[PDB]
Amino acid sequence: GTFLFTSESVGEGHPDKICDQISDAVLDAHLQQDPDAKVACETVAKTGMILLAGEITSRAAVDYQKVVREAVKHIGYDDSSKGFDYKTCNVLVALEQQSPDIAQGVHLDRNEEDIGAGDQGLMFGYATDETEECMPLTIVLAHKLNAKLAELRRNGTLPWLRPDSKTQVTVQYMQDRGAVLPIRVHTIVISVQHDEEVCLDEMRDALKEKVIKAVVPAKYLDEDTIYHLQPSGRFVIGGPQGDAGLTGRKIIVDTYGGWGAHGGGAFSGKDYTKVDRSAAYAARWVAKSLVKGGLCRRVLVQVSYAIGVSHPLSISIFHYGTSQKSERELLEIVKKNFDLRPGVIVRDLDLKKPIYQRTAAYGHFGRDSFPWEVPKKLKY
Amino acid sequence: GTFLFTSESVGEGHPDKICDQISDAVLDAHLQQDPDAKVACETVAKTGMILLAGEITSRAAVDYQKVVREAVKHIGYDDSSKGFDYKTCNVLVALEQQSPDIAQGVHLDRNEEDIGAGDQGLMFGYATDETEECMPLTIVLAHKLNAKLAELRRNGTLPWLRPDSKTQVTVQYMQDRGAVLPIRVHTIVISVQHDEEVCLDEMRDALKEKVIKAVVPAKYLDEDTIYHLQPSGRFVIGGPQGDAGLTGRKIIVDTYGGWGAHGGGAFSGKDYTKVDRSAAYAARWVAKSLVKGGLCRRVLVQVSYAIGVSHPLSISIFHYGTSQKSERELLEIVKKNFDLRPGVIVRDLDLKKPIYQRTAAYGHFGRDSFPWEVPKKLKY
Ligand SMILES: C[S@@+](CC[C@H](N)C(=O)[O-])C[C@H]1O[C@@H](n2cnc3c(N)ncnc32)[C@H](O)[C@@H]1O
Ligand SMILES: C[S@@+](CC[C@H](N)C(=O)[O-])C[C@H]1O[C@@H](n2cnc3c(N)ncnc32)[C@H](O)[C@@H]1O
Ligand SMILES: [Cl-]
Ligand SMILES: [Cl-]
């Protein structure tokens, strides 16, 4: 009854994550001035370049040079020796207004509660009782390993660290009536950009002793655990110089680490009318509410939309056999307790608030008691 | 025991799909001259612009202007009246060599069969016996609706059509011992870019009669089926002008439509050493081999890698209760029958062949008897 499952995470200076953070820094800058900004900001990163491309209609006056550079500064790319520098990189802007054809079909002359979805699409929410925060252990540990690297970089403990990192955790689980129970950590991968002077043995020792042991409970680590620490052997070139980044290329890191499902849409750079984000957040909220409400131990929620139509086209509940109630009964409870129109979600989840840059690293879920993480008390 | 499930697809001129196709046109151009090209080509599209960004180390001499423009021509963007023109758009190139640090850790001085994975990551394969091609009906129908639009555009039947389209299909299913049985089509969405002159009623009538009825069997359509046809009301602005495109932003359209799972990696623009593509193709091959071999009716396969390491770190089989054999037994059969090192996958699936542009619209799976669609005869 045992099986393996693997999830990954990346650090704040991973080039795709740089892009997500910049896209959300732009979104937040707009929302600070215009809560109703329509934002669809993609970011592209390569050696020496941040490009913004997309569509924004907003009353805000935003200094893109400043917003981009401050985001890169925060991440830690502040010198040519690190491969990227906020002070001296190129910032290029290819931003136009939102298509009038989209605007007229989605939101113009519509009551806010009755605004249409900003696009078609499908979205999933997921929750699992295997951790208190209702997230898969695999991805929680992977995120925490990247956070630990950033912490030890920023506090000067391991000053050879640079911002670009990736981690991956394989856990052995036991099946438990549709729920899953972590047993042990089978394999850990860590790759992190480093300075030219530190040797592989120093890095591997530090990664085990100061990173892994500081994050992963000893009860999960044993003589059989496999460690792949700096497995490429050399990672001096990194950030956008090593690998191009784009917004919305870490959508599984952003969500459930391979568990559950994904509808394909990216989160970062998008205001609440883009259901790719708002409906995914609401679907997480539903899933977590079902688990915290004691209705099931593990659950997947699907919703879908048509552009210009407010109400979801479909809603589906999959409980993995972890409830006494049927999936049909759970769906009825969901429909009686939630209104998944985007113009209602915005109110319930406070989605005009400029907190989005905070969501753009270390996963959008399972952290910091954002509104979608505070379960709804269900009536049934 | 019934439930809904929704999947989407997009057309060849959807701006994200333009990027995928261009990325794979670049890959194919390199492979035609250098079968061992190392390619990581991202494409970005916005009004008047195709940008190539990424990393290529190759002996080929490739004319990027020509390759990009020919790809856009094929898609159908050939006039300013359509919002984009291959003849007159900007093509910008920000391509550098592959990082030497990656090269040394992955492939330099390694026996081909023993080359390391080109990155860490996780990948899934999926197969379902609900269709002959072992794909979810929801996504098969969604793809076919986009293909029909392109067909009627190109044959001049509906000459108001333009290349940018999206479709979405919701099917009502019955549960069947872990397998799924389609019952009916619950909802169809179609949005397609159109000329300034055609009216909404003409379009909606044509979309129902000449597109939907030509694709979806009548047995699935009934008086209750919901149709959202041009639901935005107006879609004259389209292509990159309406919405920025990026490579690797349609990864669920490329795969299983929300069914199964995804590890996050994009396919297009990448050579075989990038396990995001090759291992996902191999995992599809495994899944389809299990179903076609009669070992299960529906199955999800996970694999994962570390950069620089040839053998997978983990392999997992989830059969939804659709086999008499345990998941442990199926995993043993998989391990005895498949070698998922990237330097073996390349041989089994012929992954140096320049066929990738053909994969970059209408899904990578369930079509055209590519090597990963031809099941392996299993010994057990
Ligand atoms: C391995 S690169 C993807 C492949 C790459 N585009 C190429 O040209 O081969 C993907 C990510 O891995 C990490 N990476 C970059 N250089 C690396 C290195 N030398 N060793 C390990 N990981 C590296 C960075 O986080 C980067 O964004
Ligand atoms: C709706 S746009 C995404 C949101 C957009 N970035 C914005 O600024 O609001 C996503 C996709 O929908 C399609 N689309 C573009 N304009 C549309 C329109 N007027 N009506 C329906 N779909 C449209 C195109 O396929 C496009 O790539
Ligand atoms: Cl990556
Ligand atoms: Cl889209």
Short mmCIF file of N, CA, C and O in Angstrom, two decimals, chain A residues 3-6 8 42 44 46-47 51 54-55 96 101 104-105 119-122 124 166-168 175 186-187 189 191 231-232 234 236-237 243-244 246-249 251-252 257-258 261-262 264 266 302 304-305 307 313-314 316 318 327, chain B residues 3-6 8 42 44 46-47 51 54-55 96 101 104-105 119-122 124 166-168 175 186-187 189 191 231-232 234 236-237 243-244 246-249 251-252 257-258 260-262 264 266 302 304-305 307 313-314 316 318 327:
data_model
loop_
_atom_site.label_atom_id
_atom_site.label_comp_id
_atom_site.label_asym_id
_atom_site.label_seq_id
_atom_site.Cartn_x
_atom_site.Cartn_y
_atom_site.Cartn_z
N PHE A 3 3.60 4.07 -1.74
CA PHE A 3 3.96 4.62 -3.04
C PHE A 3 4.83 5.84 -2.83
O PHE A 3 4.86 6.42 -1.74
N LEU A 4 5.52 6.26 -3.89
CA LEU A 4 6.30 7.48 -3.88
C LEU A 4 5.53 8.60 -4.56
O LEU A 4 4.77 8.37 -5.50
N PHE A 5 5.80 9.83 -4.13
CA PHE A 5 5.31 11.01 -4.87
C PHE A 5 6.34 12.09 -4.74
O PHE A 5 6.92 12.29 -3.66
N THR A 6 6.55 12.81 -5.83
CA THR A 6 7.58 13.84 -5.92
C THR A 6 6.95 15.19 -6.26
O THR A 6 6.10 15.28 -7.13
N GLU A 8 8.32 19.60 -6.64
CA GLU A 8 9.43 20.55 -6.64
C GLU A 8 8.98 21.93 -6.20
O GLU A 8 7.80 22.29 -6.21
N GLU A 42 2.61 40.19 -18.53
CA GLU A 42 3.57 39.12 -18.64
C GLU A 42 4.96 39.74 -18.52
O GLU A 42 5.20 40.87 -18.96
N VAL A 44 9.18 38.73 -19.11
CA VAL A 44 10.17 37.88 -19.74
C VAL A 44 11.53 38.31 -19.26
O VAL A 44 11.83 39.51 -19.23
N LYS A 46 15.80 37.51 -19.59
CA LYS A 46 16.98 36.82 -20.13
C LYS A 46 18.16 37.69 -19.73
O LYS A 46 17.99 38.71 -19.07
N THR A 47 19.39 37.31 -20.05
CA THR A 47 20.58 38.06 -19.66
C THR A 47 20.36 39.55 -19.87
O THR A 47 20.09 40.02 -20.97
N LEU A 51 11.55 42.31 -19.86
CA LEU A 51 10.55 42.83 -20.77
C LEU A 51 9.18 42.64 -20.17
O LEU A 51 8.84 41.54 -19.75
N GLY A 54 1.96 42.85 -22.56
CA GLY A 54 0.60 42.57 -22.17
C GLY A 54 -0.28 43.79 -22.24
O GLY A 54 -0.04 44.70 -23.03
N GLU A 55 -1.33 43.74 -21.43
CA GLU A 55 -2.46 44.66 -21.55
C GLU A 55 -2.86 45.18 -20.20
O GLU A 55 -3.20 44.41 -19.30
N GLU A 96 0.06 47.63 -23.81
CA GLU A 96 -1.02 48.37 -24.45
C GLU A 96 -2.26 48.30 -23.57
O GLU A 96 -2.27 47.64 -22.55
N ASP A 101 -12.63 44.96 -27.28
CA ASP A 101 -13.56 43.88 -27.53
C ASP A 101 -13.70 42.99 -26.29
O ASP A 101 -14.80 42.54 -25.97
N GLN A 104 -15.68 45.20 -23.51
CA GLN A 104 -17.12 45.31 -23.72
C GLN A 104 -17.84 44.01 -23.40
O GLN A 104 -18.99 44.02 -22.97
N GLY A 105 -17.18 42.88 -23.60
CA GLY A 105 -17.79 41.59 -23.36
C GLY A 105 -17.74 41.09 -21.95
O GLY A 105 -18.49 40.18 -21.59
N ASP A 119 -12.27 35.36 -19.14
CA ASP A 119 -11.89 34.40 -20.15
C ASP A 119 -12.70 33.15 -19.89
O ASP A 119 -13.29 33.00 -18.81
N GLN A 120 -12.72 32.24 -20.86
CA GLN A 120 -13.10 30.86 -20.56
C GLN A 120 -11.99 30.20 -19.77
O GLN A 120 -10.87 30.73 -19.68
N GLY A 121 -12.24 29.00 -19.26
CA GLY A 121 -11.19 28.13 -18.73
C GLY A 121 -11.72 27.28 -17.61
O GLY A 121 -12.87 27.38 -17.20
N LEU A 122 -10.83 26.41 -17.16
CA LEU A 122 -11.10 25.48 -16.07
C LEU A 122 -10.06 25.70 -14.99
O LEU A 122 -8.93 26.06 -15.28
N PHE A 124 -8.84 24.22 -10.79
CA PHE A 124 -8.99 23.26 -9.72
C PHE A 124 -8.53 23.79 -8.39
O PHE A 124 -7.51 24.52 -8.32
N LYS A 166 16.54 25.59 -6.95
CA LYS A 166 15.47 24.61 -7.15
C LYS A 166 15.63 23.50 -6.13
O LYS A 166 16.77 23.14 -5.76
N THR A 167 14.49 22.96 -5.68
CA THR A 167 14.52 21.84 -4.77
C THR A 167 13.47 20.83 -5.20
O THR A 167 12.53 21.16 -5.93
N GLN A 168 13.60 19.59 -4.75
CA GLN A 168 12.65 18.55 -5.12
C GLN A 168 12.64 17.51 -4.02
O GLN A 168 13.70 17.06 -3.59
N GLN A 175 -1.17 4.54 1.68
CA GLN A 175 -2.59 4.75 1.36
C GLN A 175 -3.43 4.51 2.63
O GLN A 175 -3.20 3.55 3.35
N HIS A 186 12.22 9.97 0.81
CA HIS A 186 12.97 9.03 -0.01
C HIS A 186 14.16 9.67 -0.71
O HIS A 186 15.23 9.08 -0.73
N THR A 187 13.95 10.85 -1.31
CA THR A 187 14.99 11.55 -2.07
C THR A 187 14.80 13.04 -1.92
O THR A 187 13.66 13.53 -1.94
N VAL A 189 16.50 16.61 -3.75
CA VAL A 189 17.36 17.35 -4.66
C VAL A 189 17.45 18.79 -4.23
O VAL A 189 16.42 19.39 -3.94
N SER A 191 19.54 22.21 -5.94
CA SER A 191 20.49 22.90 -6.83
C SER A 191 20.38 24.37 -6.55
O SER A 191 19.30 24.95 -6.59
N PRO A 231 23.74 18.36 -7.87
CA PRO A 231 24.03 17.22 -8.73
C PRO A 231 24.61 17.58 -10.08
O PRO A 231 25.23 16.70 -10.70
N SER A 232 24.46 18.81 -10.56
CA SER A 232 25.12 19.19 -11.81
C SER A 232 26.63 19.39 -11.64
O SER A 232 27.35 19.46 -12.63
N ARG A 234 28.27 22.09 -10.84
CA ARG A 234 28.70 23.49 -10.97
C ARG A 234 27.49 24.31 -11.42
O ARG A 234 26.84 23.97 -12.42
N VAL A 236 27.46 28.21 -11.31
CA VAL A 236 27.94 29.60 -11.14
C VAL A 236 27.11 30.55 -11.97
O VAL A 236 26.64 31.59 -11.47
N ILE A 237 26.92 30.21 -13.24
CA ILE A 237 26.00 30.94 -14.11
C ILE A 237 24.58 30.59 -13.67
O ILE A 237 24.25 29.42 -13.53
N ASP A 243 19.18 30.75 -17.91
CA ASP A 243 17.94 30.16 -18.38
C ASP A 243 16.89 31.25 -18.46
O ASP A 243 16.63 31.93 -17.48
N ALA A 244 16.27 31.42 -19.61
CA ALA A 244 15.22 32.40 -19.76
C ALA A 244 14.06 32.13 -18.83
O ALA A 244 13.70 30.99 -18.57
N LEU A 246 9.93 33.24 -17.79
CA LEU A 246 8.66 33.79 -18.24
C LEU A 246 7.65 33.70 -17.13
O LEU A 246 7.68 32.76 -16.33
N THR A 247 6.72 34.65 -17.07
CA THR A 247 5.57 34.53 -16.17
C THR A 247 4.77 33.29 -16.49
O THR A 247 4.55 32.96 -17.66
N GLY A 248 4.28 32.63 -15.45
CA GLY A 248 3.33 31.54 -15.64
C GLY A 248 3.91 30.24 -16.13
O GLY A 248 3.19 29.46 -16.72
N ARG A 249 5.19 30.01 -15.83
CA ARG A 249 5.91 28.80 -16.17
C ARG A 249 6.24 27.95 -14.94
O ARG A 249 7.01 26.97 -15.06
N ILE A 251 3.45 26.89 -12.75
CA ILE A 251 2.08 26.85 -12.27
C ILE A 251 1.81 25.71 -11.32
O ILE A 251 0.85 25.76 -10.55
N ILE A 252 2.63 24.66 -11.37
CA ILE A 252 2.51 23.52 -10.46
C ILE A 252 3.22 23.80 -9.13
O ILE A 252 2.71 23.47 -8.07
N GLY A 257 1.97 20.88 -6.61
CA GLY A 257 3.13 20.02 -6.68
C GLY A 257 2.91 18.69 -7.37
O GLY A 257 3.62 17.73 -7.11
N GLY A 258 1.93 18.63 -8.27
CA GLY A 258 1.60 17.41 -9.00
C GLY A 258 0.38 16.73 -8.45
O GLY A 258 -0.25 15.95 -9.15
N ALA A 261 -4.94 18.57 -9.61
CA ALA A 261 -4.99 18.79 -11.04
C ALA A 261 -4.76 20.28 -11.27
O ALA A 261 -4.76 21.08 -10.33
N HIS A 262 -4.62 20.65 -12.53
CA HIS A 262 -4.46 22.04 -12.92
C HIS A 262 -5.23 22.29 -14.21
O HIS A 262 -5.24 21.43 -15.09
N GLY A 264 -4.49 24.96 -16.22
CA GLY A 264 -3.52 25.52 -17.15
C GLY A 264 -3.22 26.99 -16.99
O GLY A 264 -2.20 27.44 -17.51
N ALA A 266 -2.15 30.65 -15.60
CA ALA A 266 -1.20 31.27 -14.70
C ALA A 266 -1.91 32.26 -13.80
O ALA A 266 -2.93 32.82 -14.16
N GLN A 302 -13.27 21.03 -9.29
CA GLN A 302 -13.15 21.67 -10.58
C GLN A 302 -14.26 22.72 -10.72
O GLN A 302 -15.39 22.50 -10.31
N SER A 304 -15.42 25.79 -14.00
CA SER A 304 -15.10 26.29 -15.34
C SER A 304 -16.00 27.46 -15.69
O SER A 304 -17.07 27.62 -15.09
N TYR A 305 -15.58 28.25 -16.69
CA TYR A 305 -16.22 29.49 -17.08
C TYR A 305 -16.23 29.65 -18.59
O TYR A 305 -15.43 29.03 -19.30
N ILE A 307 -16.00 33.14 -21.23
CA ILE A 307 -15.79 34.58 -21.26
C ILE A 307 -17.14 35.30 -21.36
O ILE A 307 -18.00 34.94 -22.16
N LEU A 313 -19.78 27.44 -15.51
CA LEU A 313 -20.44 26.49 -16.40
C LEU A 313 -20.57 25.11 -15.78
O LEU A 313 -21.49 24.36 -16.13
N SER A 314 -19.64 24.75 -14.92
CA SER A 314 -19.61 23.45 -14.28
C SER A 314 -18.89 23.59 -12.95
O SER A 314 -18.02 24.44 -12.81
N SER A 316 -17.47 20.52 -9.99
CA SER A 316 -17.31 19.10 -9.74
C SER A 316 -16.50 18.88 -8.49
O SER A 316 -15.56 19.62 -8.20
N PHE A 318 -14.48 15.77 -6.25
CA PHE A 318 -13.89 14.43 -6.24
C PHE A 318 -13.26 14.24 -4.87
O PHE A 318 -12.31 14.94 -4.54
N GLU A 327 -20.16 12.29 -3.49
CA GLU A 327 -19.68 13.48 -4.21
C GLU A 327 -20.85 14.36 -4.62
O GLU A 327 -20.75 15.57 -4.55
N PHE B 3 -21.09 12.81 -12.99
CA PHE B 3 -20.36 14.03 -12.70
C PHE B 3 -20.06 14.75 -14.00
O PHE B 3 -20.10 14.15 -15.07
N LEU B 4 -19.71 16.03 -13.89
CA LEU B 4 -19.27 16.81 -15.03
C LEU B 4 -17.75 16.91 -15.04
O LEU B 4 -17.11 16.95 -13.99
N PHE B 5 -17.19 17.05 -16.23
CA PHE B 5 -15.76 17.41 -16.36
C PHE B 5 -15.61 18.26 -17.58
O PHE B 5 -16.23 18.00 -18.62
N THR B 6 -14.76 19.28 -17.47
CA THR B 6 -14.56 20.27 -18.51
C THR B 6 -13.09 20.29 -18.94
O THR B 6 -12.19 20.27 -18.12
N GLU B 8 -10.51 22.34 -22.19
CA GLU B 8 -10.45 23.32 -23.28
C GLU B 8 -9.37 22.96 -24.29
O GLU B 8 -8.45 22.18 -24.04
N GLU B 42 12.40 29.93 -26.15
CA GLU B 42 11.13 30.50 -25.76
C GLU B 42 10.75 31.54 -26.81
O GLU B 42 11.61 32.22 -27.39
N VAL B 44 7.91 34.80 -27.49
CA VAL B 44 7.00 35.77 -26.93
C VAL B 44 6.34 36.52 -28.07
O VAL B 44 7.04 36.93 -29.01
N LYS B 46 3.52 39.67 -29.07
CA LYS B 46 2.57 40.77 -28.75
C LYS B 46 2.39 41.51 -30.05
O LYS B 46 2.95 41.13 -31.08
N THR B 47 1.56 42.54 -30.10
CA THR B 47 1.27 43.28 -31.33
C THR B 47 2.56 43.53 -32.11
O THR B 47 3.50 44.16 -31.62
N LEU B 51 9.47 37.68 -30.36
CA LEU B 51 10.77 37.65 -29.74
C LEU B 51 11.17 36.23 -29.43
O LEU B 51 10.38 35.49 -28.82
N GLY B 54 16.32 32.64 -25.14
CA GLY B 54 16.72 31.35 -24.65
C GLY B 54 18.12 30.97 -25.05
O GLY B 54 18.97 31.84 -25.27
N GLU B 55 18.34 29.67 -25.10
CA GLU B 55 19.69 29.11 -25.18
C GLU B 55 19.74 28.01 -26.21
O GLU B 55 19.00 27.03 -26.12
N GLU B 96 21.34 32.98 -26.77
CA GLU B 96 22.74 32.76 -26.42
C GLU B 96 23.03 31.27 -26.42
O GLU B 96 22.14 30.46 -26.62
N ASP B 101 27.92 25.62 -17.67
CA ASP B 101 27.76 24.91 -16.41
C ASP B 101 26.69 23.83 -16.54
O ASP B 101 26.84 22.74 -15.99
N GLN B 104 28.26 20.95 -18.93
CA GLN B 104 29.23 20.07 -18.30
C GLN B 104 28.57 19.10 -17.34
O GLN B 104 29.04 17.98 -17.14
N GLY B 105 27.46 19.50 -16.73
CA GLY B 105 26.77 18.66 -15.77
C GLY B 105 25.81 17.67 -16.34
O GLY B 105 25.42 16.72 -15.66
N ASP B 119 17.47 18.69 -16.51
CA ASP B 119 16.97 19.47 -15.39
C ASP B 119 16.41 18.47 -14.39
O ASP B 119 16.20 17.30 -14.72
N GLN B 120 16.16 18.93 -13.17
CA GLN B 120 15.26 18.21 -12.29
C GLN B 120 13.83 18.36 -12.79
O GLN B 120 13.56 19.21 -13.65
N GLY B 121 12.90 17.62 -12.21
CA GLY B 121 11.47 17.86 -12.39
C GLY B 121 10.70 16.59 -12.30
O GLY B 121 11.25 15.49 -12.16
N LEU B 122 9.39 16.76 -12.37
CA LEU B 122 8.43 15.67 -12.32
C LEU B 122 7.56 15.74 -13.56
O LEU B 122 7.31 16.82 -14.08
N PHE B 124 4.11 13.56 -15.70
CA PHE B 124 3.07 12.56 -15.67
C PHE B 124 2.65 12.10 -17.05
O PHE B 124 2.57 12.93 -17.99
N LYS B 166 -10.65 29.59 -29.33
CA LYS B 166 -10.68 28.78 -28.12
C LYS B 166 -11.98 28.01 -28.09
O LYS B 166 -13.03 28.52 -28.54
N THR B 167 -11.92 26.79 -27.54
CA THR B 167 -13.12 25.99 -27.38
C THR B 167 -13.09 25.33 -26.01
O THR B 167 -12.03 25.20 -25.39
N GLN B 168 -14.24 24.90 -25.52
CA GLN B 168 -14.31 24.26 -24.20
C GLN B 168 -15.50 23.34 -24.20
O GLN B 168 -16.60 23.73 -24.60
N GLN B 175 -19.47 7.17 -13.51
CA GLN B 175 -18.41 6.40 -12.87
C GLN B 175 -18.62 4.90 -13.16
O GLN B 175 -19.74 4.40 -13.07
N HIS B 186 -22.68 18.43 -22.02
CA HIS B 186 -23.44 19.35 -21.19
C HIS B 186 -23.36 20.79 -21.66
O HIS B 186 -24.39 21.46 -21.70
N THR B 187 -22.15 21.25 -21.99
CA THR B 187 -21.92 22.64 -22.41
C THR B 187 -20.80 22.67 -23.41
O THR B 187 -19.80 21.96 -23.26
N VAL B 189 -18.42 25.78 -25.33
CA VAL B 189 -18.00 27.15 -25.61
C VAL B 189 -17.18 27.19 -26.88
O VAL B 189 -16.29 26.36 -27.04
N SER B 191 -15.18 30.47 -28.93
CA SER B 191 -14.85 31.87 -29.23
C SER B 191 -13.84 31.88 -30.33
O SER B 191 -12.80 31.23 -30.25
N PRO B 231 -19.52 34.09 -26.87
CA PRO B 231 -20.16 34.66 -25.70
C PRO B 231 -19.68 36.04 -25.32
O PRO B 231 -20.40 36.74 -24.60
N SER B 232 -18.51 36.48 -25.78
CA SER B 232 -18.09 37.85 -25.52
C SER B 232 -18.86 38.87 -26.37
O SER B 232 -18.81 40.06 -26.09
N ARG B 234 -18.15 40.02 -29.34
CA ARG B 234 -17.33 40.68 -30.37
C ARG B 234 -15.88 40.26 -30.13
O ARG B 234 -15.35 40.39 -29.02
N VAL B 236 -13.08 40.88 -32.79
CA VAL B 236 -12.42 41.36 -34.02
C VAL B 236 -10.93 41.50 -33.79
O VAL B 236 -10.12 41.02 -34.60
N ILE B 237 -10.55 42.14 -32.70
CA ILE B 237 -9.15 42.19 -32.26
C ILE B 237 -8.80 40.81 -31.73
O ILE B 237 -9.51 40.25 -30.91
N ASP B 243 -3.94 39.76 -26.99
CA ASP B 243 -3.48 39.06 -25.80
C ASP B 243 -2.07 38.56 -26.05
O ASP B 243 -1.84 37.84 -27.01
N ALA B 244 -1.13 38.91 -25.19
CA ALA B 244 0.22 38.43 -25.33
C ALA B 244 0.29 36.92 -25.26
O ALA B 244 -0.44 36.27 -24.51
N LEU B 246 2.98 33.45 -24.96
CA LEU B 246 4.27 32.94 -24.53
C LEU B 246 4.32 31.44 -24.76
O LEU B 246 3.30 30.76 -24.64
N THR B 247 5.50 30.91 -25.04
CA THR B 247 5.69 29.46 -25.06
C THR B 247 5.38 28.86 -23.71
O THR B 247 5.74 29.42 -22.67
N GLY B 248 4.74 27.70 -23.72
CA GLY B 248 4.57 26.93 -22.49
C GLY B 248 3.50 27.44 -21.56
O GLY B 248 3.57 27.17 -20.37
N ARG B 249 2.50 28.12 -22.11
CA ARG B 249 1.36 28.65 -21.38
C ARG B 249 0.06 27.91 -21.72
O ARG B 249 -1.03 28.36 -21.31
N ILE B 251 -0.04 24.24 -21.25
CA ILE B 251 0.51 22.93 -20.97
C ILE B 251 -0.56 21.89 -20.69
O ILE B 251 -0.29 20.68 -20.82
N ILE B 252 -1.75 22.32 -20.30
CA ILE B 252 -2.88 21.41 -20.06
C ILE B 252 -3.61 21.09 -21.36
O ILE B 252 -4.00 19.95 -21.60
N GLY B 257 -6.05 17.97 -20.49
CA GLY B 257 -7.29 18.70 -20.34
C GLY B 257 -7.85 18.75 -18.93
O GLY B 257 -9.05 18.92 -18.75
N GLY B 258 -6.98 18.63 -17.93
CA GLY B 258 -7.38 18.66 -16.54
C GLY B 258 -7.41 17.28 -15.92
O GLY B 258 -7.34 17.15 -14.71
N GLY B 260 -5.87 13.47 -15.15
CA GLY B 260 -4.51 13.08 -14.78
C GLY B 260 -3.87 14.16 -13.95
O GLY B 260 -4.47 14.67 -13.03
N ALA B 261 -2.64 14.55 -14.26
CA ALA B 261 -1.87 15.51 -13.49
C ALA B 261 -0.83 16.10 -14.43
O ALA B 261 -0.63 15.62 -15.55
N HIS B 262 -0.13 17.11 -13.95
CA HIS B 262 0.95 17.74 -14.70
C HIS B 262 2.08 18.08 -13.74
O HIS B 262 1.82 18.51 -12.61
N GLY B 264 4.42 20.46 -14.57
CA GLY B 264 4.66 21.88 -14.75
C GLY B 264 5.48 22.26 -15.95
O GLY B 264 5.45 23.42 -16.34
N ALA B 266 6.97 22.79 -19.69
CA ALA B 266 6.52 22.99 -21.05
C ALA B 266 7.26 22.06 -21.99
O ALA B 266 8.39 21.66 -21.72
N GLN B 302 3.66 8.77 -12.71
CA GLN B 302 4.59 9.83 -12.38
C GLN B 302 6.02 9.32 -12.54
O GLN B 302 6.32 8.19 -12.19
N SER B 304 10.22 11.23 -12.06
CA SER B 304 10.95 12.45 -11.69
C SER B 304 12.44 12.25 -11.89
O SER B 304 12.91 11.10 -11.94
N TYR B 305 13.18 13.36 -11.96
CA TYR B 305 14.60 13.38 -12.28
C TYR B 305 15.33 14.42 -11.44
O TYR B 305 14.73 15.35 -10.90
N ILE B 307 18.80 16.98 -12.20
CA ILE B 307 19.74 17.41 -13.23
C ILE B 307 21.05 16.64 -13.10
O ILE B 307 21.60 16.49 -12.01
N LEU B 313 14.47 9.38 -10.45
CA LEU B 313 14.51 9.32 -8.99
C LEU B 313 13.33 8.57 -8.40
O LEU B 313 13.44 8.00 -7.31
N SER B 314 12.20 8.60 -9.08
CA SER B 314 10.98 7.96 -8.62
C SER B 314 10.15 7.62 -9.84
O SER B 314 10.21 8.31 -10.86
N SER B 316 5.93 6.11 -10.23
CA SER B 316 4.71 5.79 -9.50
C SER B 316 3.59 5.50 -10.47
O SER B 316 3.48 6.13 -11.52
N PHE B 318 -0.70 4.90 -10.62
CA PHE B 318 -2.00 5.07 -9.98
C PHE B 318 -3.04 4.58 -10.97
O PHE B 318 -3.21 5.17 -12.02
N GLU B 327 -1.16 -1.68 -7.72
CA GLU B 327 -0.27 -0.64 -8.26
C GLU B 327 1.18 -1.05 -8.12
O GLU B 327 1.97 -0.81 -9.01
#
